[PDB]
Amino acid sequence: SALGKLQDVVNHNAQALNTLVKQLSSKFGAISSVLNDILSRLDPPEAEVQIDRLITGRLQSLQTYVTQQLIRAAEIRASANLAATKMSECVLGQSKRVDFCGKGYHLMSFPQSAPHGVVFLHVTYVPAQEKNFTTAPAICHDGKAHFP
Amino acid sequence: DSTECSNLLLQYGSFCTQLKRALTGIAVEQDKNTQEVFAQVKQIYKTPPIKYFGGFNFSQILPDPSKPSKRSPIEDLLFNKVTLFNGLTVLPPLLTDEMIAQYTSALLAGTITSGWTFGAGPALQIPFPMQMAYRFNGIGVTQNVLYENQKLIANQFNSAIGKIQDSLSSTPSALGKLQDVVNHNAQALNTLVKQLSSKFGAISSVLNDILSRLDPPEAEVQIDRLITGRLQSLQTYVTQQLIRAAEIRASANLAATKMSECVLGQSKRVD
Amino acid sequence: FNGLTVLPPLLTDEMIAQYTSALLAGTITSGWTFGAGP
Amino acid sequence: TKCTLKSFTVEKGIYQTSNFRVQPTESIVRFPNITNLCPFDEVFNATRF
Amino acid sequence: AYTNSFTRGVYYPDKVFRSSVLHSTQDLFLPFFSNVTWFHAIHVDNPVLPFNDGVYFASTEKSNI
Amino acid sequence: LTGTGVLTESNKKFLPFQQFGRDIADTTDAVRDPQTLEILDITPCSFGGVSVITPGTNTSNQVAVLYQGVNCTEVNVFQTRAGCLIGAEYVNSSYECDIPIGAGICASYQTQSIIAYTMSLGAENSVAYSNNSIAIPTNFTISVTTEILPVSMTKTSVDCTMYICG
Q1: Is F136 in contact with B124 (CB distance < 8 Å)?
Q2: Chain A residues with CB inside 8 Å of F139's CB?
Q3: Distance set, CA E54 to CA B252, E10, E49 (Å)
Q4: Considering CB atoms only, which of B102, B113, B197 is closest to F129?
Q5: Is C25 in the A-facing interface, judged by CB distances under 8 Å?
Q6: Which residues pair up as cystines (chain A)?
Q7: Does C36 reach chain F within 8 Å, measured CB to CB?
Q8: How far apart are CA D47 and CA B244, in angstroms?
Q9: Beta-carbon count within 10 A of B169 CB
């Protein structure tokens, strides 16, 4: 599950559409869900009031769907802005911002395309094999202090 | 828990399922935000016992072994400064307050004893005055300037830390933001529960009377209104929560960035 | 379907891969410079 | 859990399947408390009609 | 005569207990600082007064007159 | 006044002409008996959500159940600040958490059983501070880390009227 995020995006969209199409079967209080039958077995005066319910219900469903899509689109755009920044700053140069382009001292980064996003290969430099030493802040020679 | 109402609610579809899904998404998001901000360090670094760092006085921020909660005094001041069914439940957070305080103490020990190193890999110990000399170079001032005014600099720092607590206590609305978060949530739930009393056009607000003083055929149309009205109210509530959650997430990302860049290192970004 | 479509994207995947290859070649042969000018 | 996820294979995790609610065990006679009636033993047990 | 009615005339409207809380209600009250007619119990005798919607009757006396 | 719930002896002073008690938002909290005039508290009987903890269809069919907003004293058994958990045994050992239950409690497959335990925030490293000592690295290692980011979503178009009424 390394690509959880991209997969998540796809699943969310698919699920939203699924529920939207599924909601056509609901009756919302009308005697039936299919329009043809209503227009077949009823006079126009009563079929009219039986059709209002279907209209209003389907309209609410659609309205919620579009709102959800707006929120998610804002979300993805925030993410995309972040990605563009990462491209510019980590790939086209070297960043001193700590722990932005990967954990460790950043050297460079390589981009790789993905179905709906990017995969950055941050190359970082990490120290190791430390050792103890004794230190002093300055050296005194000839009565005057020296600093490195 | 009215049988006839569930029987009628079956006609609207899977709305409640859908909203339930939305809310679970929000909850998991909250936990991830805390994770992202605080759980940056891998190892819980402990503070040495002889707490002498060349004149600097960190007593106000290090955890207090005296109090049982083990929060620094400033943290305690914060906890005291801010204060505060029908199928509604507020799940507890995953990280208890204690664990968050523990993470914070770890970050402090790391930064006091190792500088930025502990943020880039193996934590390397360094005497604290030399660490500050490094930082002085970081802003373009030669390090000898620090060694010649060590005492004075330490005094200024101690006094400033001391005035911080007084400022937080004397400031009347310093914690406006957190207090505001709490109040918004409380108010939202309050209006949601209070709106159950509205009739929305139905002849009465309690369903029992509705089903008592009326024949079933007419009780149907008297119950439709209550159903739709309460459903719409709940729907708006959920949308408001989505928007606020997006905003808070933006803020949390900003906080995480600030952690990484200002705490674990030194930033040249102005202001 | 019932009126619900899925318009296609403007940049095909192929062209995106080409852009990526361009960035790689640039960074491999020229370092920072290709982002600031020649 | 399978019924909620509509899937024969459920992955590792935690799922909110349903709700429970303790049922009422009794009914308590629905009453206020009375005190007095009206004149009936003075209309049917009347001495003279 | 005339006299403004100060903060008087409020009454419990719903016989429902509530503790340490603020509540807003729309009902027939005596507006504050409104003038109220004043009459004396010396002699003549008393005129009829209409009952528009509700009357607030106050009396200060010491003889059960 | 009709409702359901548990009745408890009250400690609040109803005024003598009062018949009801209300908290904020009209929740009827108390009532006085029409016979003995005693004050009674109303509490809605316990209710809550139930959750299932599962290690995966492909590992095993074992399962543990969590009653969230309740105490089992009125439902192996374990009580938590998040609710009472049944079917998993509490161990004193602390681990890196994978199935989050809440309030610092988690669960995982022991291996052959489902165990609940408190989270571990990592190992303790007490770096040796001293006023005159320095640790310097003598070797290095360059690593590569992968970061993924979503960029876009499916463009969707809908025909209103068709979707509405075919």
Answers
A1: yes
A2: 127-129
A3: 59, 13, 11
A4: B113
A5: no
A6: 90-101
A7: no
A8: 82
A9: 12
